[model samples]
Target: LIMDIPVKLTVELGRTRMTIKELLRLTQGSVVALDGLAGEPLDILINGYLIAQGEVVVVADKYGVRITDIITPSERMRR
Candidate 1:
């Protein structure tokens, strides 16, 4: 048998790093330089937390997330 589970959903793009001086120098409307890049998979969280990752896709002339892999609890720990 199979089951579908869902509660809260969230999407994440990428992470960035900066120092206090670098951070303070940023002005409004500034963008964070992502460690991630284009054509890369983004993160998906369930129950308000990270659980899996997926790639971006266009469907019905709209954007959608395509589930690629579901990470195990141990996998997330090392990451």
Candidate 2:
């Protein structure tokens, strides 16, 4: 069953493209700009496929994601 199988879950906050020179210059306190804007929901992926999106929250000193949207099977098929 699906529940019995393992899946690789990923949380994407943002992405950016950097050149080799820019990458090598990265150091502590250096800020790199990402493509995603702040306050945007994080993308949740299972086995490299997007399944849902959520916002991050702090609960009892721990971090968790609250699901905001779920991709239905029919929607996935359209992609």
Candidate 3:
């Protein structure tokens, strides 16, 4: 028998280093390009794996993700 475990997935959008000018430019659908690509696997974090990827989904009016890939296990830990 097999079971599917649920995990929360998240994408690490850029951090505080972004400039004020960049912030001001943002608008809905403004396409603040991320460091990754459109098809890039978004991180699938098992308590924040630090590596995993998938597509976003809607569940009961809440946002969810489906795991499509996992990054190398070693990549999970770093300073």
Candidate 4:
């Protein structure tokens, strides 16, 4: 049977890059600024694939994506 594939929907707040030295530092209170803003829409990934960008709904404090935009093409793909 070759039909359906296994995967998972994961939420991504933002992305950032850091050096190996900085990544190894141990600290209680630390910050790693990402490529996102406060209250910004989170990235929706299906098995590590970018599909949608949306805000999170906390009706019962459960993280549910309120899908707003369907990411595609090479328009919004530019950085």
lDDT agreement with native, every candidate: 0.79, 0.82, 0.64, 0.79
The sequence of per-residue lDDT tens digits that candidate 3 reaches over residues 12-51 is 5333456779979887987665565655555655566466
**Which 10 successive residues of model 3 have the least lDDT summed?**
9-18
RMSD for each of the candidates = 3.5, 3.1, 6.0, 2.5
lDDT of 2 by residue, 1-79 (tens): 5668766887888778778899789899988889887888877888888889888889999878888989867767654
lDDT of 4: 0.79
Clash count, predicted structure 4: 0
Predicted model with the maximum TM-score: 4
Per-residue lDDT tens digits for candidate 1, residues 1-79, read 4587646787777777667887888899976788888868788877767878888888999878998878777777666
The model with the greater lDDT, 2 or 3, is 2
Q: Which residue pairs in candidate 3 have backbone atoms (N, alpha carbon, C) closer than 3 angstroms, thus clashing?
A: 42-53, 43-52, 44-52
Q: Output the worst ten-in-a-row residue range by lDDT, candidate 1.
A: 1-10
- Give the least accurate 10-residue stretch of model 2, judged by summed lDDT: 70-79
- List ranges where model 3 is wrong by over 4 Å: 1-9, 13-21, 24-31, 46-49, 74-79
- Model 1's alpha-carbon lDDT is 0.79
| Clash counts for all predictions | 0, 0, 3, 0
- TM-score of every candidate relative to the true structure: 0.68, 0.74, 0.45, 0.76
Measured by TM-score, how close is model 1 to the native structure? 0.68
